[PDB]
């Protein structure tokens, strides 16, 4: 009953004998499977996550200047030297200024100067390498009546999924992504994570780490002064306008692609296939409503004593003679006395009568389908 209400929904019917169903799973989309002698199931790809990811490079977006030291030298004299020049944490630049009597020198000419400032990074961006081999696909299987979750990885594509009271299925899948992971990088900022190109990330003009390499990308020296580029947080958001975000910070992470699956319904069974037909009265708990795909959903309460039994439902014609409609929910059951059952029906185009129960005590509902 999971796919009921979902807009992007696909109905897949099995082979004449059953045993196997070919389906395609993607984020947002819901798949309803139908097979002869097998129960109706609801398949949905909840999450796709990268388990083991190797770190490639870490850039600096937010920085600040600290402890500025200036070393001055008059003409003819040697070049100025500072202890901060050999230290990797400090950024140093060498230049020559016009020195003389006004500057405080005995001789006139270009005098050597060196400025050193401490580089401190507060905001850093992480970039992890992606691989198709390390991708965990979470598929939820729900029966027509919170379901059962299953993990799929290219290493272990086929997984035997157990469904209590309904037996079990063999879920064999194949990951098919239209994006080349060899040319992609999983870049993480604060809480959110994006899927960006490999070259774009490596060509970013910011200081990076395998001590920061290329510190001059954010620190600018003014010959008379040190200036910082500020926070590149907003600068990234503008460039990430076209890039698809994996994790949103809420925990919901998804990758653009399709998961082609071949569900083996060999050992699957319908709960209550041996149940007798309900003899007692039936009453509508909730009025029958039409879905976005033309199918109708109805809630019925059992008033008899023959429980656990099978709900007798038939979609008959205008003159209520021959059955001209099919039931999606495979073999609906009434568990106990005064129990509510959810049923998905497929009425034909035009006038149709839904008969729920047995004999004259049976409930009759009129329905009209447009198109």
């Amino acid at each position, epitope marked *: 009953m999971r796919c009921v209400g979902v807009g992007n929904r696909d109905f897949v019917e099995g082979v004449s004998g059953g045993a196997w169903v070919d389906l395609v799973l993607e984020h947002g989309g819901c798949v309803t499977t139908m097979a002869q002698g097998k129960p109706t199931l609801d398949f949905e790809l909840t999450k796709t996550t990268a388990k083991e990811v190797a770190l490639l490079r870490t850039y600096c977006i937010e920085a600040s200047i600290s402890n500025i030291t200036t070393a001055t030298r008059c003409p003819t004299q040697g070049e100025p030297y500072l202890k901060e020049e050999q230290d990797q944490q400090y950024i140093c630049r060498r230049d020559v200024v016009d020195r003389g009597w006004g500057n405080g020198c005995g001789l006139f000419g270009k005098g050597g100067v060196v400025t050193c400032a401490k580089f401190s990074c507060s905001g850093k961006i992480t970039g992890n390498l992606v691989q198709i081999e390390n991708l965990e696909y979470t598929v939820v299987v729900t029966v027509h009546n919170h379901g*059962v*979750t*299953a*993990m*799929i990885t290219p290493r*272990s594509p086929s*997984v*035997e*999924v*157990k469904l*209590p*009271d309904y*037996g*079990e299925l*063999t879920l064999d899948c194949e990951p098919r992504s239209g994006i080349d992971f060899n040319e992609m990088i999983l870049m993480k900022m604060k809480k959110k994570t994006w899927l960006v190109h490999k070259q774009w990330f490596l060509d970013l003009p910011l200081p990076w780490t395998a001590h920061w390499n290329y510190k001059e990308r954010m620190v600018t020296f003014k010959v008379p002064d040190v200036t910082v580029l500020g926070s590149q947080e907003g600068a990234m958001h503008s460039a990430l306008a076209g890039a698809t975000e994996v994790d949103s910070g809420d925990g919901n992470h998804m990758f653009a692609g399709h998961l082609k699956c071949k569900v083996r319904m060999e*050992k699957l069974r319908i*709960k209550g296939m*041996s*149940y007798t037909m309900c003899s007692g009265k039936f009453s509508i708990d909730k009025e029958m409503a039409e879905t976005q795909h033309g199918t109708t959903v109805v809630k019925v309460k059992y008033e008899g004593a023959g429980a*656990p039994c099978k709900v007798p439902i038939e979609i008959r014609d205008v003159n209520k003679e021959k059955v001209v409609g099919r039931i999606i929910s495979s073999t609906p059951l009434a568990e106990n006395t005064n129990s509510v059952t959810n049923i998905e029906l497929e009425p034909p185009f035009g006038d149709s009568y839904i008969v729920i129960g047995v004999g004259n005590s049976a409930l009759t509902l009129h329905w009209f389908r447009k198109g």
Partner: antibody
Amino acid sequence: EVQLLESGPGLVKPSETLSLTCTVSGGSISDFYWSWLRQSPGKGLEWIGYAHSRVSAYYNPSLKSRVTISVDTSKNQISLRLSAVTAADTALYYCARQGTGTTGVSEDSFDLWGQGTKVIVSL
Amino acid sequence: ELQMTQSPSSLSASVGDRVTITCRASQDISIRLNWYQQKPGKAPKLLIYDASTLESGVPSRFSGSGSGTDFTLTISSLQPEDFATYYCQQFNSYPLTFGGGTKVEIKR
């Protein structure tokens, strides 16, 4: 040979949480369905629930509210976590391989059984 | 909801005798039933799976019968190795429930 070894402790005070481990040796843990079962005179063989490395765990409605079973592939062990433990929980805990059809012998049939761990509940 | 009741609680028989262990279910479980053997101190051992199919290594004397509600475990010729407690379990509906148990003792 595929072996199942149960780890204690076999003494838990009432209201405290009971923790038991089942190590799978001489076989891959990530392929089979592993289930926990308890035995005590007056209750007999009681099925607690099963757990899988890739598939979600399922438990008995009698213990579901206070029981948690998980599969640790890195440590090759199945952990059983029973909370709000009472005097009725005093039983011999077994860890067994729940069959499917392709694995074991047949669907939901415990072929490989553990040694068993005696758990006593008292102050 | 579904209750598994096996009769008798205890059984007294000699070596060579034909024993009959009956397992009853409150609801229809079809051919879905498993039989187990348990000796004191040792873990249970599966003998008959799918109500009639015998497990590998289990002697020809052991036989499985029944479908739906009433089930039967039969040992054509009892042996000293066969004296243990016998259990029956269902797998048609969850949770998986076990029977009361039938202890087969030596007739003296």
